[PDB]
Design a protein around this nucleic acid. Sequence first.
DNA 1: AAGGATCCAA
DNA 2: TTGGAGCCTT
Length: 115
Amino acid sequence: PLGSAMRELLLSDEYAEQKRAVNRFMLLLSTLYSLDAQAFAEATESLHGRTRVYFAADEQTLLKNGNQTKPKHVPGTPYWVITNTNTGRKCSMIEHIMQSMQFPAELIEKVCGTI
DNA sequence: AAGGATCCAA
DNA sequence: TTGGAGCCTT
């Protein structure tokens, strides 16, 4: 059901249209949220750095728990995510979320490679 | 400004 | 051996 939407996303025109890791990163998130805004929330409450906070309803909250985190507003959602990270960390975040929303590792790996 | 590999710390 | 983030090329 959800796996379908994601798989459709990677093939979508606008996904292929994003030109940078971040944009693709945002889109995956935006999409994972609209899929199950509920499950997304739970997967989210359990995702954070060793000192940095990753997602938060307000920006200052990200601005308050780390230095030069690049808070960006996840379009379509009530969440903000940090952006000062390498593609490896981005996949790690996506990976953490999808795992929570219990996705097939196969597809999960498929997504990261597109980031 | 912005993105994100690179590099350093824990 | 995972995570932070100043830093320098777009």
